Amino acid sequence: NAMLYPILTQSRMLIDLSGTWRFKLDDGSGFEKKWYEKTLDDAQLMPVPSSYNDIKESADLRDHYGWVFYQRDLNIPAYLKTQRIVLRFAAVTHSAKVYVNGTLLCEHKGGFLPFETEIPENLIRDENLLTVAVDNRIDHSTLPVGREDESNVLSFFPYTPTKKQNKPNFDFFNYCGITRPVKLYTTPKDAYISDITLTSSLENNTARINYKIDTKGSAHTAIGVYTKQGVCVAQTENTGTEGSLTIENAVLWEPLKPYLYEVKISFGEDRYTLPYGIRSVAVKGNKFLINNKPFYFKGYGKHEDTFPAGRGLNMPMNAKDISLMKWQGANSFRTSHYPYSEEMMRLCDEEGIVVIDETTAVGVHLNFRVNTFDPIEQGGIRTQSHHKEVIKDLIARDKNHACVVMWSIANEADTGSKGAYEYFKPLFDLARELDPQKRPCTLVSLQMVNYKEDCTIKLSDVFCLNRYYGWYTCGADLQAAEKMCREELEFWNSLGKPFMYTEYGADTVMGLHDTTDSMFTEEYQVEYYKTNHKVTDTLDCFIGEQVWNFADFATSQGLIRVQGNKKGLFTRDRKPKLAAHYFKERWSKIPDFGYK
Amino acid sequence: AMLYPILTQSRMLIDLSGTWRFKLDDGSGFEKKWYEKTLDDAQLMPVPSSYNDIKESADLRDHYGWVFYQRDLNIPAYLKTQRIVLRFAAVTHSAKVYVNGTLLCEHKGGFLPFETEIPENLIRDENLLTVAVDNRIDHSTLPVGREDESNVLSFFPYTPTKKQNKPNFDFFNYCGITRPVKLYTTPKDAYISDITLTSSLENNTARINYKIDTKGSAHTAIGVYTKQGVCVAQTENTGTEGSLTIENAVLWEPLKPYLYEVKISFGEDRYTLPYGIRSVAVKGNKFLINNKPFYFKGYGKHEDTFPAGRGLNMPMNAKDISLMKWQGANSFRTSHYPYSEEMMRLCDEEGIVVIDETTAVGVHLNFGKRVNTFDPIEQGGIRTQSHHKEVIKDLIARDKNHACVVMWSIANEADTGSKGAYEYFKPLFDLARELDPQKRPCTLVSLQMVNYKEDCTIKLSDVFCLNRYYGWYTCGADLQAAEKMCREELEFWNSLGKPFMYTEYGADTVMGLHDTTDSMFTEEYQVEYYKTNHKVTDTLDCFIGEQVWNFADFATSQGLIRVQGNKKGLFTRDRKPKLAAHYFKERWSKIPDFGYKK
Ligand SMILES: O=C(O)c1cn(C2CC2)c2cc(N3C=CN([C@@H]4O[C@H](C(=O)O)[C@@H](O)[C@H](O)[C@H]4O)CC3)c(F)cc2c1=O
Ligand SMILES: O=C(O)c1cn(C2CC2)c2cc(N3C=CN([C@@H]4O[C@H](C(=O)O)[C@@H](O)[C@H](O)[C@H]4O)CC3)c(F)cc2c1=O
C-alpha cells in the first residue's frame, strides 16, 4: 500500500527502464501460447512511457480491444542482488500482468496509480526478459466505467460494428499502455523505510511537523528538517516511530508562494528525503480556509493529454502548463478524472499550485430499467469494492502533498438516484479515516433536474458543481441561461456551505468567429463565461471557478465531438483562444484570498 | 460635373449591370474591330465586378493589356424624345466605349465616373454596347506602375514568362467594369447638370448657399425638406446662384447623421439631393467638426471582397459600416482611390466621417543613371501631374456636397522628402483649395522616411497624416525599441503645434496564429504592437486621430512578404474579428468622438 516516490539516495539505486520497448497486439492466443516466455516475435517498437493508441497511423491499433504485450531486456549487475530489488510501475492503464523471465510477478487493476513488486533474487538470471501485458477493457466493474451494450455516450440509424470496441461511459478517449515510467530501485535488504507520514500543527503561534515513520526490520531512526538553502532547523536522533518537531521561523506554503522544507529520514543505512510544505486547510462556515485565510479557487479541470503520447507523462508540457496557469492568473486545478503522475503532483508542490485530487470514479451512472445503485445481483454497478481500493491507494500516494487541499470521490456519479447515499457513505467515511490531515471531501455533481436530491448535500464538505448553462441547455440563449443559472445557484447559496464550479464551458473551435452569439465561436465562449459570472459574482458562498477545460483533448468519435472535446481555453498545442485572454484579465483582478 | 444618377419625375434610370460577354484581347481585337460585331468565342463576366478572380485561370487573373466587354442594348424608342446618357460609374483603368461600332468616348482613370450621350441617329432597333478596358499601369498612370519588371515587395534574378503589370503599390491590380453601368435620361432642352451647396451657421440658423448649373433656358426652383417631409426653405426663379436659411437646423454629426432633402427643379427637370449641414475647420492643433474637437477613430480601408475584387458590393458595404459602429469607429480613409458613390452616400446616411483620397499612390521612383521622382519629364521623372490635376478636379466635382467628407488626401506615400516634391504638389494643393466650395482641409499621406523633417507635407498640409510602422517594418519584435523610436519622431511632429494623426499603423496578423510571448504574425503581437504605439500617441496633445492599417485583410501582388495578400486587417477578408479587433472595440468604447484632447 505505502508508495513512497522513488528517488536516488545514498542507500537507494534508481534505474529508469523507460525507452523503446517491443510491443505486440494480442490476437486472443497471447496467453495460451505463453508469449511472455520468449522474445516477442513479429513485434513493433513502442515508446515507454506513452499511451500506445496514437503513436502509429493504424486505426486497428488505436481502437484495439483487449490485451497488448510490452517487453524489454533487463540485464543488471549482479551486485544489485546484495540489495532489495524493486520494480515500480508508476501507471499501467488499465490492468497489468508483469512477468520476469517466465514468471508472473504481479497483477494490478486500476490504470492511474502505482504498483510495485520485489524481484526475488533466485529469479534473476544473467540475462532477463521483462514482459508487461496490458488490458484496455472497461465495463461495469472498472473505474473508469465502460458501457456493456453497443451504446455510445455521445446512432440515428442502427448499425452493427465491424469489430468489438470499448464503449467509454465518460467523455475522454480510452488511452492505454504503459502510461508512466517503469523504474527499478533498491533499498537495504534488512532495514528500510516503507512509508513516511507528515502533518502540520500551527496552534499557539508554534509551527510543528508531526511525523510517523513506517519501517521494516530493526534499526535506529532519525529525522532532520532543512531549509531550501540547507540549514538544519530541527533534528533528532534515535527517535521513536512517531514524534513532533518545532520549526522556528516557519515559512508557510501558500498558493502561488510555495515553500518546501526538505525532511530527511534515516533508518539503519536507509536514507530518504521528502519535500514538505507546511500549511493548514479547513472548511468553516462558507469559507475554504488555507492557512486561516478565505481562499477563492481560480483555475480548471484538466486532462493528462498531449500529442502524440496521449495520457503519457510529458514533463516539458507539465512545466509549460504550469507556466500558462501562472500567466493566466490561475491558482488551482482538479485532476479530472483520475490521479495524475507524481511528477505533476511534485511540481505543483514546488510551484504553489493548489490541487483538487480526484479518484478514477467517472461513469458511475447507468442511466445517463436498472438503476445505477440497484443491488449487484439485479444489475447495479459493480464498482464499490474497487472504489475503496482506489481511495486507499490515492490517499496513501498523495497524503503528504501540501498542494492537495481536497479529495474528490467521484465525477458525475448518479447521485440524485436511490441508493447513491448508501454507495457513497462508506467511501467518504474511508477518505476521512485515512487522510492524516483530514482534508475536506467532495464529489463532483452532475447537472440534474432534481438537484435538490443530490446526495452531495448529505456527504460533502464543499459542493462542487458541473454546470453548462448556455451550452447543454439554453444554447445560444444566454439571457435564458442567466435566469436558469441564478434560480439553481440561489438554492445552493442558501445552504450556507462553500460551493463552486468544477466545470463550466462551451465547445470552441479556434478560428471560428461571429460578432453575434453563435455556438462554437470564440466570442460565444467569452459571452458564455460573462453570463455565468454575472450570477456567481453575486453569491457569497460561491468560493471558486474552475472552467471546463484547461485545453482541448481527445475523446471517442461522435456527431457532437469536433475532433475531440473543444471546451479548452487553450488548444491541444496550448495556444490561447479569445476566452483565455478574457480569463487572464478577469483572474488578474480577483485575489487568491479575500475575494468574497 | 457628375450628379449621381437617380430615378425622378423627369429622369429614367435603367441599370445595365448583369451578365455581359467578355473576351481577352489577343493583340488583334482593335485591328479586327471586335466592337463592330457580336463578340465571338467569348466568356461571360458579371458586371459590375473586377474580372480577375471570377474564374480559375492565372492567365485571366494576370492578363496584361485590353479586354472587351459587350452586351445588347435594345431600348424603347419612346426614350428618343429624351436626352439619353450612358453613365459608367468606374472602369479600371482606361476605357473605350462603342455603340454599334462607333467610338463614343474614352476615359483615363479607373475610379471616377464618366458619361456620354448616345446620339439619337446612332440608335437602331437592336444595338451593341462594347466597352474596351485597359489594365496597364506605368509612370503616367494613377496608380503608378513600374517600368522595370521588378517587384515593389527576388533573391536570384529570373526572366518572367509573360509581361505583367508591376504595381508600385501594395494592393492587387483589380480591373474590369468595377461599378455599375447605367442608362439614364433627362429632358432635351433644359436640364440640371450640377449642384453646389455650402452652409454657414448663424446661431441656430443655417444659411445654405447654392449654385445650380444648368443647360438651356428655364426657371430654377429649390426647396429644402426635412427627413419627415416638411418644407423648411423654398425660393423660386433664383437663377444660378443664391441662398436660403433653415430655422433651428438639425446639424449632421458623426454617428448622429441628419440629411435634409434638397429638391431642385429646372424647367421640366427634377433632381433631389440629400444634404447634411455641418462645419469643418482646422484651428490650432484642433480638427473642429461643428466647432468641437474631433478625435478620429477608424481605418484605412480598401474596396476589396471575394470574388468581385474591387467591384461594388452593396451588402458588404452595409456590413462594414455595421462593423465599424460595433467597434466604435467614427471614420475611415478611402485608401487609395475614390470609393463608389454608393458607399459615400451610405456614409452620409450613417454618420461615418471620410477622408477622401485621390488615386495618387506610387508617385515615387526610388521606393542607366539614377533618376529623381520629380525630375523633368524629359529627364525621366514621373509623368503624372497633368492626370493628377484631372483626378483632383473630378473627385471634388463628384464628392463636394458630401457632409461625410471632411478632408482631401492629395496622394499616398509619394516621394515627398526629395527635391522637387514641393514644386509638384503646390499646384495640386492650390487646385484642391480653389475648387472645393467648402474649403475643407487638405493633406498628403506621408511615407515613413529617415529625413522626415524634410517632408514637404510640412509646407502644404493642414493636417499631418503619417503612415508609420514602429514595431513592424522597423523594430520588429522589439516593442521597447519601437516605443522609444516612435516617441522620438512623434514628439517632433507634436512640437509643430498643428493637428497630426496616424492614417496607417499595423502588423500583419494571420488569424489562428498565437503565442503568449511576442512573435510577429500572431494575434497577440498585433494587440501588443498597438498598445505600444498608443503608449506614445495618448501622451501627445496634437495627435488628433488614429486610423489603423487596415480594416480587413485584402489582396495584393505575390511576394515573399505577402502571406496570400496583406494581413494587417483587424478583420479577415470575410470580416471576422481578430483579437486586435476586440482590443479596439474596448479601446474606442472608452474614447469620445469629441473632447478626448481638449
Ligand atoms: O448530444 C447531446 O445532447 C449531449 C451529449 N453529452 C455527452 C458528452 C457527450 C451530454 C453530456 C452531459 N454530461 C456529460 C459530461 N459532463 C462533463 O462534461 C464535459 C463535456 O461534456 O464537455 C465532459 O468532458 C466532462 O468530463 C464531464 O464531467 C457534463 C454533463 C450532459 F449533461 C448533456 C449532454 C448532451 O446533451
Ligand atoms: O528575401 C529574399 O528574397 C530571400 C530570403 N532568404 C532567407 C533565409 C530565408 C533567402 C535565403 C537563401 N538561402 C536559401 C536556402 N537556405 C536553406 O533553406 C531553408 C529555407 O529558407 O526555408 C532554411 O530553413 C535551411 O536551413 C537552409 O539550408 C536558407 C537561405 C537564399 F538562397 C535566398 C534567399 C532570398 O532570396
Side-chain angles (χ1 to χ4, degrees), chain A residues 1-31 35-37 39-40 43-106 108-121 123-124 126-149 153-155 157-162 165-166 168-202 204-215 217-227 229-234 236 238-247 249-256 258-283 285-368 370-417 419-437 439-457 459-533 535-588 590-596, chain B residues 1-30 34-36 38-40 42-77 79 81-95 97-119 121-123 125-148 150 152-154 156-161 163-165 167-187 190-200 204-206 208-210 212-214 216-226 228-233 235-240 242-246 248-255 257-282 284-291 293-368 371-377 380-392 394-418 420-422 424-433 435-458 460-483 485-487 489-497 499-534 536-589 591-598:
Chain A
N1 188 67
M3 291 300 308
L4 288 176
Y5 183 67
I7 53 166
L8 184 70
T9 84
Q10 298 84 339
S11 68
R12 298 192 175 209
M13 213 76 54
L14 186 53
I15 303 206
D16 193 339
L17 299 180
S18 301
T20 294
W21 293 43
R22 298 185 291 271
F23 176 96
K24 188 182 186 65
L25 296 177
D26 183 31
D27 60 2
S29 73
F31 294 100
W35 288 357
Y36 47 86
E37 291 188 345
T39 314
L40 297 184
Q44 339 182 21
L45 301 174
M46 202 34 87
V48 171
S50 188
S51 301
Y52 61 73
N53 310 79
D54 289 357
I55 298 302
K56 315 293 178 166
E57 322 314 308
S58 168
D60 285 333
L61 177 44
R62 179 193 65 191
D63 302 325
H64 178 69
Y65 184 80
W67 291 92
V68 307
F69 290 83
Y70 288 79
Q71 190 187 73
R72 62 159 289 169
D73 310 328
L74 175 54
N75 302 328
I76 66 152
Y79 59 54
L80 250 51
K81 308 199 244 153
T82 67
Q83 311 294 299
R84 169 172 164 265
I85 297 331
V86 185
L87 258 186
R88 171 71 72 88
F89 294 88
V92 176
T93 319
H94 285 290
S95 285
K97 294 191 192 317
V98 176
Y99 307 83
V100 170
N101 301 334
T103 305
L104 172 72
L105 273 189
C106 63
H108 183 260
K109 171 177 176 185
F112 300 90
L113 282 167
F115 60 96
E116 68 181 22
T117 178
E118 280 202 44
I119 292 174
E121 52 170 32
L123 187 44
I124 305 175
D126 181 58
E127 302 166 342
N128 309 280
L129 288 181
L130 177 62
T131 309
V132 180
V134 181
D135 188 7
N136 70 21
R137 289 170 302 162
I138 47 174
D139 60 19
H140 290 184
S141 71
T142 66
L143 296 173
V145 172
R147 293 154 84 100
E148 304 178 347
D149 65 353
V153 63
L154 309 175
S155 175
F157 305 94
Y159 74 99
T160 298
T162 300
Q165 294 187 41
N166 293 298
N169 210 30
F170 46 87
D171 189 34
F172 59 92
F173 182 87
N174 193 221
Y175 279 120
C176 286
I178 304 186
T179 308
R180 294 182 194 148
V182 182
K183 304 191 184 179
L184 201 69
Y185 77 90
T186 64
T187 74
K189 273 222 198 93
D190 266 336
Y192 63 87
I193 303 152
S194 56
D195 199 14
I196 300 157
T197 301
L198 304 177
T199 65
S200 302
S201 299
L202 306 184
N204 285 308
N205 297 143
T206 302
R208 319 185 272 101
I209 295 176
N210 312 292
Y211 58 87
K212 158 177 165 224
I213 300 153
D214 294 322
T215 58
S218 201
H220 289 120
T221 312
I223 177 163
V225 180
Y226 299 78
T227 64
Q229 335 74 48
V231 182
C232 187
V233 293
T236 184
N238 201 6
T239 88
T241 170
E242 297 200 43
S244 58
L245 293 169
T246 297
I247 314 301
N249 301 316
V251 174
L252 298 186
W253 190 100
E254 311 249 20
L256 296 169
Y259 193 87
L260 295 178
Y261 289 86
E262 286 206 293
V263 180
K264 339 199 195 160
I265 290 160
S266 310
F267 181 70
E269 317 281 76
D270 199 19
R271 296 291 189 272
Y272 190 95
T273 296
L274 175 54
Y276 189 68
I278 304 175
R279 60 97 189 90
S280 66
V281 181
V283 167
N286 65 352
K287 316 247 181 33
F288 196 99
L289 301 175
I290 301 175
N291 299 321
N292 212 36
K293 298 177 295 193
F295 188 62
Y296 189 79
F297 293 84
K298 295 179 292 168
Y300 326 87
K302 277 189 115 281
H303 264 292
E304 286 183 326
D305 172 284
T306 71
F307 182 83
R311 196 83 56 231
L313 172 64
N314 184 333
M315 295 182 59
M317 212 43 105
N318 287 356
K320 164 55 59 177
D321 281 359
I322 292 183
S323 169
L324 284 172
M325 301 169 10
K326 291 189 170 192
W327 169 86
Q328 209 165 28
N331 57 32
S332 68
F333 69 90
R334 175 178 54 117
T335 65
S336 18
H337 300 298
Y338 38 78
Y340 287 10
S341 69
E342 299 100 313
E343 286 81 5
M344 196 48 165
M345 304 315 309
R346 288 167 72 90
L347 191 61
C348 289
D349 260 1
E350 292 271 11
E351 296 275 348
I353 301 298
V354 167
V355 177
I356 300 168
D357 208 353
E358 187 166 278
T359 70
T360 50
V362 55
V364 188
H365 199 318
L366 296 183
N367 297 106
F368 256 123
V370 168
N371 317 280
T372 302
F373 302 112
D374 271 341
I376 293 176
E377 59 265 33
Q378 288 144 33
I381 197 76
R382 312 177 335 171
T383 52
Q384 196 196 43
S385 186
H386 179 59
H387 202 153
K388 302 158 136 163
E389 281 317 282
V390 172
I391 288 164
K392 274 181 235 182
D393 291 339
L394 173 59
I395 293 174
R397 193 195 73 169
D398 286 359
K399 51 177 158 58
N400 292 321
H401 283 305
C403 66
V404 172
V405 302
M406 176 132 80
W407 309 103
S408 171
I409 301 300
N411 180 79
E412 307 202 317
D414 193 359
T415 60
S417 64
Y421 177 81
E422 309 58 38
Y423 178 94
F424 276 108
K425 191 39 187 205
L427 311 179
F428 276 79
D429 288 350
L430 186 63
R432 271 128 192 189
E433 164 47 22
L434 293 176
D435 180 10
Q437 307 186 7
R439 270 158 284 208
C441 294
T442 189
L443 42 62
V444 172
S445 285
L446 176 63
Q447 184 160 0
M448 86 151 90
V449 293
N450 66 321
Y451 56 87
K452 298 183 181 175
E453 299 170 347
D454 190 341
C455 73
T456 193
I457 296 168
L459 291 161
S460 299
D461 299 296
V462 178
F463 303 130
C464 292
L465 312 177
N466 291 357
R467 297 297 186 267
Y468 290 90
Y469 311 111
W471 188 257
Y472 292 123
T473 181
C474 302
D477 195 339
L478 287 173
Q479 162 159 3
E482 192 184 329
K483 192 167 173 293
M484 185 175 174
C485 171
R486 176 165 298 281
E487 163 141 60
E488 174 176 355
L489 296 198
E490 280 175 343
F491 161 78
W492 293 100
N493 199 64
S494 77
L495 303 179
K497 291 174 177 182
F499 79 107
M500 89 197 264
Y501 275 162
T502 37
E503 302 195 5
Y504 62 133
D507 283 83
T508 303
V509 178
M510 169 167 287
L512 302 193
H513 295 272
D514 200 324
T515 62
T516 311
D517 286 353
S518 180
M519 292 172 67
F520 291 99
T521 63
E522 290 191 46
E523 288 76 16
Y524 187 77
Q525 196 182 27
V526 172
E527 289 299 331
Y528 171 100
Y529 280 121
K530 285 183 170 173
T531 289
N532 275 267
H533 293 152
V535 175
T536 67
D537 279 333
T538 71
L539 301 175
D540 79 316
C541 299
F542 185 97
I543 51 101
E545 56 195 58
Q546 292 185 339
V547 302
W548 195 251
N549 185 287
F550 174 79
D552 300 339
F553 62 87
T555 69
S556 299
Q557 307 260 322
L559 293 165
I560 67 157
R561 285 289 170 268
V562 191
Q563 192 167 35
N565 186 300
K566 283 289 192 288
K567 295 194 173 68
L569 300 187
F570 302 87
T571 61
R572 206 193 195 183
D573 62 335
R574 268 63 173 167
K575 304 176 167 317
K577 302 176 188 175
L578 183 65
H581 292 287
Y582 164 82
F583 267 101
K584 180 172 165 65
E585 175 71 14
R586 172 174 168 84
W587 286 342
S588 81
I590 294 176
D592 299 317
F593 294 99
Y595 184 47
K596 307 270 184 94
Chain B
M2 278 321 143
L3 301 177
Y4 181 66
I6 55 174
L7 185 66
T8 82
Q9 302 88 345
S10 67
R11 299 189 176 210
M12 293 288 335
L13 186 55
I14 295 167
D15 196 351
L16 305 175
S17 307
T19 298
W20 292 40
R21 295 184 285 269
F22 177 98
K23 193 159 156 92
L24 296 181
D25 186 17
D26 62 6
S28 74
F30 292 105
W34 289 355
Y35 52 82
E36 282 178 4
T38 302
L39 294 183
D40 157 83
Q43 327 175 221
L44 311 175
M45 204 31 87
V47 169
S49 179
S50 308
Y51 59 72
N52 306 79
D53 281 353
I54 297 303
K55 314 294 181 155
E56 296 332 290
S57 163
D59 292 346
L60 179 38
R61 182 193 66 194
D62 302 324
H63 181 66
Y64 183 77
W66 290 92
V67 306
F68 292 80
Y69 287 78
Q70 187 186 77
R71 66 162 281 169
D72 311 295
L73 186 62
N74 304 330
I75 69 185
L79 313 195
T81 62
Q82 314 297 299
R83 165 173 170 265
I84 298 170
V85 185
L86 271 168
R87 168 69 70 90
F88 298 85
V91 177
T92 318
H93 288 289
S94 290
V97 172
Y98 309 81
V99 169
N100 292 329
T102 308
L103 178 64
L104 286 195
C105 61
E106 323 199 26
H107 184 260
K108 177 185 181 178
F111 303 85
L112 284 167
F114 57 99
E115 66 181 21
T116 184
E117 295 197 7
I118 311 176
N121 46 100
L122 201 64
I123 308 180
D125 272 320
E126 313 155 29
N127 306 280
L128 284 180
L129 174 54
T130 306
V131 187
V133 184
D134 186 10
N135 71 16
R136 290 168 307 154
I137 49 173
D138 64 14
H139 292 183
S140 67
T141 59
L142 291 182
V144 168
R146 295 153 87 82
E147 300 176 1
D148 89 334
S150 78
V152 52
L153 306 174
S154 174
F156 309 101
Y158 79 90
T159 289
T161 298
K163 157 105 143 143
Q164 288 184 235
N165 289 302
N168 201 38
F169 48 87
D170 186 32
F171 59 88
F172 185 81
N173 190 45
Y174 280 122
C175 290
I177 305 185
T178 312
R179 294 177 195 150
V181 180
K182 308 193 186 179
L183 197 132
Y184 73 95
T185 65
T186 75
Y191 61 93
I192 304 153
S193 52
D194 217 352
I195 301 162
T196 306
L197 305 176
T198 64
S199 58
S200 304
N204 309 145
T205 285
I208 291 159
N209 311 274
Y210 60 76
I212 301 164
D213 289 297
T214 62
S217 288
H219 300 281
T220 326
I222 176 165
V224 182
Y225 292 76
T226 63
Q228 299 91 15
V230 168
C231 196
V232 301
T235 89
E236 303 192 291
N237 277 30
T238 185
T240 297
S243 38
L244 52 78
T245 52
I246 312 308
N248 314 97
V250 183
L251 303 183
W252 188 103
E253 299 272 12
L255 291 315
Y258 187 98
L259 295 173
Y260 288 86
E261 293 239 78
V262 179
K263 302 177 185 166
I264 302 208
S265 63
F266 180 70
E268 277 335 310
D269 204 19
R270 312 265 307 281
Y271 191 90
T272 298
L273 196 62
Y275 187 67
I277 300 170
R278 60 105 192 72
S279 62
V280 183
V282 169
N285 63 359
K286 303 298 169 41
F287 197 99
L288 299 174
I289 302 176
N290 297 321
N291 211 38
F294 191 60
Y295 189 77
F296 291 87
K297 298 176 284 174
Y299 344 71
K301 289 183 96 290
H302 262 292
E303 284 188 320
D304 171 282
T305 71
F306 182 83
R310 196 88 55 233
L312 172 63
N313 183 337
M314 264 194 297
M316 194 75 87
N317 286 353
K319 163 58 53 176
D320 297 343
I321 287 188
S322 170
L323 286 171
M324 310 167 186
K325 294 193 172 186
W326 171 84
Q327 205 162 30
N330 57 32
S331 66
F332 68 94
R333 175 176 55 118
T334 74
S335 39
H336 302 298
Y337 38 76
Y339 284 8
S340 68
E341 297 101 311
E342 285 85 4
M343 187 46 153
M344 309 288 310
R345 287 167 74 89
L346 190 62
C347 289
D348 265 2
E349 275 262 53
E350 299 271 345
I352 302 294
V353 166
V354 174
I355 297 174
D356 211 349
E357 188 166 282
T358 73
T359 54
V361 57
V363 189
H364 200 318
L365 295 184
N366 308 290
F367 205 98
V371 179
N372 289 3
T373 301
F374 299 112
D375 267 354
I377 293 202
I382 206 73
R383 333 204 300 268
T384 49
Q385 201 203 199
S386 155
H387 181 61
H388 202 152
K389 280 135 145 183
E390 292 305 308
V391 170
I392 293 168
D394 292 325
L395 175 60
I396 294 179
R398 195 192 72 171
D399 287 357
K400 47 159 145 53
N401 292 320
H402 282 304
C404 67
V405 172
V406 306
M407 192 170 26
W408 310 101
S409 172
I410 301 300
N412 181 83
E413 291 186 347
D415 192 2
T416 56
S418 68
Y422 181 83
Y424 178 95
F425 279 106
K426 215 294 198 282
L428 311 176
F429 276 78
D430 289 351
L431 185 58
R433 277 129 182 181
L435 303 160
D436 180 6
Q438 298 183 16
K439 260 78 199 143
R440 269 160 286 207
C442 297
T443 189
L444 67 75
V445 173
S446 289
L447 169 77
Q448 186 162 355
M449 64 185 80
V450 47
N451 64 329
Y452 54 88
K453 302 173 188 179
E454 295 206 0
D455 191 336
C456 74
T457 192
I458 297 170
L460 294 158
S461 299
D462 301 300
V463 180
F464 302 134
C465 290
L466 310 182
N467 294 354
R468 295 300 187 268
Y469 291 95
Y470 310 113
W472 187 256
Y473 290 127
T474 184
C475 301
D478 192 340
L479 288 174
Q480 234 168 330
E483 196 198 329
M485 152 189 246
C486 173
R487 174 163 290 289
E489 167 167 6
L490 295 196
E491 280 178 342
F492 164 77
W493 293 97
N494 195 62
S495 72
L496 305 181
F500 77 117
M501 61 193 295
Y502 274 165
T503 41
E504 294 184 20
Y505 69 130
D508 287 83
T509 302
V510 180
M511 163 158 297
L513 299 187
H514 296 269
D515 201 330
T516 59
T517 309
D518 285 347
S519 198
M520 310 148 74
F521 294 92
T522 64
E523 284 193 47
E524 291 74 21
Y525 188 78
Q526 198 178 24
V527 174
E528 288 305 326
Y529 170 97
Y530 279 116
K531 289 222 307 193
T532 289
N533 274 265
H534 298 147
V536 177
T537 69
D538 268 338
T539 70
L540 301 176
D541 67 314
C542 299
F543 184 96
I544 61 111
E546 50 196 55
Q547 293 192 331
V548 302
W549 195 252
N550 188 288
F551 172 81
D553 302 339
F554 59 89
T556 69
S557 294
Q558 308 230 8
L560 291 169
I561 58 150
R562 285 296 172 261
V563 189
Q564 194 176 35
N566 188 300
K567 287 290 185 284
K568 292 193 180 64
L570 300 185
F571 299 90
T572 60
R573 205 192 196 179
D574 53 339
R575 270 64 174 163
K576 296 183 128 223
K578 303 175 191 169
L579 185 67
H582 292 288
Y583 166 80
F584 268 103
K585 181 174 169 53
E586 187 56 15
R587 169 175 171 83
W588 288 341
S589 81
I591 295 177
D593 297 320
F594 292 102
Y596 184 43
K597 301 183 179 188
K598 204 180 164 159

